Amino acid sequence: YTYEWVLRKDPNMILQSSLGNDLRADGASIIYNEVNLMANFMPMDHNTS
Amino acid sequence: MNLLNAAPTPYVWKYNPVTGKCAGAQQNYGATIDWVLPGGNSFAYAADEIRRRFPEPAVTRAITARFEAESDQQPYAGPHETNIITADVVRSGPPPSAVYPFDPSGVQRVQLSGGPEMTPDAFKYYLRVQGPSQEVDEPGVMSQRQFMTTFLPAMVPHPFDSESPDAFPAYFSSVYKGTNAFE
Amino acid sequence: QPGQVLSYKKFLCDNYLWTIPFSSDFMYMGELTDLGQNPMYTNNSHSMV
Amino acid sequence: ATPRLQYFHIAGPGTREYLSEDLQQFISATGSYFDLKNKF
Amino acid sequence: AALTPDLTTATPRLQYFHIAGPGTREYLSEDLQQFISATGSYFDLKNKF
Amino acid sequence: LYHDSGVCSGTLNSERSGMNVVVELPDRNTELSYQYMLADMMSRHHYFAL
């Protein structure tokens, strides 16, 4: 399967302030380096899986 | 009761997985009941009955083989594994349905970028399925499960009394005397 | 400057007593665990380190 | 299945299958004021 | 055993590359020609042969 | 109370079977066992002065 998604970079969306001020006008920014997808697989019996 | 007639603790074996040779046997102290100081006459009989109800080595062999059969990780491919090993060899190499041009012109062939013989899937799978050139296992070394089928834990009453068997901790008998050796 | 700051990720876990279950899937399937009665430990002596 | 585990109910039939039926009736009847269910 | 001779059809190069071949009306499978004729008002496939 | 001390352990036994039925293991922990049992049986923020 392919599972493509997109991450928000808007400071006002992704971040929450205790004052509600405009973070874009207040110098908030984010840089994504490595966004990996983890997964847990039950090692259930291949015969029974 | 009499402790001379009491059933002894079984000897469990040590496998030594890396060399593969048996590492010896030990008195099965790791699973023992504490029955003489707290138990007394009521539990001495119970402990004896538990000890003599230890399965005989044939029964333990059958139980272990049955446990191993339900593994799903047998050494050779079952229908699940062999089906996918056939599936990937089928979809490997040049496709059979690809109608490509064979140009036997000694001047002015085609470029044929692509992506006049072919190998059949029977031989193609035969290459993938065949085993080694040995086809016989070396003596002494055994895998864990083949060691568990043999070398079974068993009660050994009066072991150090016979004519010339003693035991197998770690040795190599040489001169008709049991030489527990390799020091 | 952002190059003059660090990060110091750390955790505290009091009263926990780290537990590793002797089970194949690391989950609870009974007090007598999955590998507890596997006749590869029960019948053969192993010297763990 | 191992006999020494069944003797100590580590792998035995279970409280419902080894207690005498009269004792089970007793501990069920007197289960709200004199609990005996934690002793087996 | 090792390699089979494999099927051959022995078509001339000029006909194989349709440089001097039969013609589009008579080498495309009749169902494909019907498909092109039907859906040729919005999906041009006559330039691909 | 001296728990899990083989040198200074307790004693419980009957009269016909005067042999002691309680052998204490220094390698078990009775105190922490009770702590875990009581924390599992009830929340630990309750104060029971008895």
Side-chain angles (χ1 to χ4, degrees):
Chain A
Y1 303 94
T2 63
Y3 171 65
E4 173 189 68
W5 216 273
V6 54
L7 272 72
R8 269 214 191 71
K9 291 170 77 72
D10 187 357
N12 288 351
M13 302 298 287
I14 73 176
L15 294 176
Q16 179 182 7
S17 190
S18 75
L19 266 63
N21 51 354
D22 192 7
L23 283 178
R24 289 94 67 90
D26 284 337
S29 67
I30 185 168
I31 301 299
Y32 292 108
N33 291 120
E34 275 283 338
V35 174
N36 303 336
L37 182 75
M38 302 293 325
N40 297 325
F41 292 80
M42 196 208 175
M44 61 155 46
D45 200 359
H46 281 185
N47 287 328
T48 76
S49 68
Chain B
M1 65 179 288
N2 194 346
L3 282 72
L4 295 181
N5 299 115
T9 314
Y11 278 167
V12 291
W13 296 92
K14 321 162 173 153
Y15 174 44
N16 188 359
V18 170
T19 49
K21 326 290 191 323
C22 173
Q26 73 175 2
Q27 192 70 259
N28 193 6
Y29 69 99
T32 48
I33 177 173
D34 186 328
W35 56 266
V36 65
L37 271 299
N41 195 236
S42 78
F43 273 116
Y45 288 101
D48 186 18
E49 200 66 29
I50 294 164
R51 283 175 322 223
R52 67 182 52 258
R53 211 149 287 161
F54 179 79
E56 51 264 17
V59 169
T60 300
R61 170 148 186 178
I63 301 299
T64 307
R66 223 180 58 229
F67 198 89
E68 180 217 350
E70 315 265 0
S71 180
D72 75 355
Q73 189 273 330
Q74 270 68 241
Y76 304 67
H80 186 193
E81 293 83 3
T82 190
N83 277 322
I84 72 187
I85 297 169
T86 316
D88 69 350
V89 306
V90 163
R91 56 210 48 179
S92 66
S97 56
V99 162
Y100 59 98
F102 172 69
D103 196 358
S105 183
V107 65
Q108 175 151 324
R109 270 169 210 70
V110 307
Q111 183 44 280
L112 183 63
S113 162
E117 284 87 9
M118 51 82 89
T119 184
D121 273 328
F123 175 70
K124 184 188 302 164
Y125 178 80
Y126 157 84
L127 298 152
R128 171 65 165 83
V129 65
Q130 65 182 357
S133 179
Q134 200 58 352
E135 294 292 327
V136 65
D137 48 354
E138 283 78 19
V141 298
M142 301 205 258
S143 69
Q144 172 90 44
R145 318 198 272 188
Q146 323 174 310
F147 176 84
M148 298 154 73
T149 60
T150 61
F151 288 69
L152 297 147
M155 282 158 35
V156 189
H158 312 150
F160 304 104
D161 291 331
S162 185
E163 67 275 15
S164 310
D166 203 73
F168 323 115
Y171 69 102
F172 64 112
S173 173
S174 287
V175 186
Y176 289 159
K177 264 262 201 183
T179 179
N180 301 296
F182 272 128
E183 64 257 48
Chain C
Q1 303 334 309
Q4 299 181 356
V5 298
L6 291 183
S7 296
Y8 284 103
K9 295 314 192 42
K10 187 188 76 178
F11 81 99
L12 290 190
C13 204
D14 303 335
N15 293 112
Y16 181 55
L17 183 63
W18 298 118
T19 309
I20 295 168
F22 186 40
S23 180
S24 55
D25 48 357
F26 295 103
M27 276 145 87
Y28 171 81
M29 293 143 78
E31 281 96 310
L32 195 59
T33 61
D34 173 11
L35 304 168
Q37 74 249 31
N38 177 10
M40 202 215 78
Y41 305 113
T42 64
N43 286 329
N44 308 101
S45 52
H46 303 278
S47 69
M48 71 175 57
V49 63
Chain D
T2 308
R4 63 185 72 259
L5 282 71
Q6 312 177 196
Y7 200 55
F8 295 103
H9 316 151
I10 292 149
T15 297
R16 214 81 70 61
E17 293 83 3
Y18 73 72
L19 290 190
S20 43
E21 311 276 310
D22 57 43
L23 182 52
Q24 301 185 51
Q25 296 294 321
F26 196 96
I27 68 179
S28 291
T30 80
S32 62
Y33 45 87
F34 199 72
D35 59 347
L36 311 180
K37 65 179 73 174
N38 45 67
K39 300 170 183 63
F40 309 111
Chain E
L3 280 74
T4 70
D6 187 28
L7 297 201
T8 58
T9 50
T11 310
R13 301 306 113 173
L14 292 205
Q15 293 204 60
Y16 177 75
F17 291 92
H18 306 111
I19 296 144
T24 292
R25 175 161 92 180
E26 58 209 274
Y27 83 82
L28 296 188
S29 63
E30 182 65 26
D31 53 8
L32 179 54
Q33 313 185 23
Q34 292 185 359
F35 191 94
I36 295 169
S37 179
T39 69
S41 300
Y42 42 83
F43 205 55
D44 266 338
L45 314 179
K46 53 149 290 172
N47 75 82
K48 299 166 173 57
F49 304 106
Chain F
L1 304 180
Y2 267 113
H3 290 110
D4 305 330
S5 183
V7 65
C8 194
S9 70
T11 300
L12 169 84
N13 46 354
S14 169
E15 65 183 1
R16 264 201 271 151
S17 63
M19 51 76 88
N20 187 4
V21 298
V22 172
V23 56
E24 274 293 10
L25 272 188
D27 55 46
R28 68 180 65 252
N29 202 352
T30 298
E31 305 295 332
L32 189 56
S33 78
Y34 185 86
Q35 293 306 106
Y36 267 86
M37 178 219 69
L38 192 81
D40 195 306
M41 171 175 68
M42 75 188 47
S43 177
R44 290 295 278 147
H45 74 275
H46 295 114
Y47 286 7
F48 187 60
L50 170 64

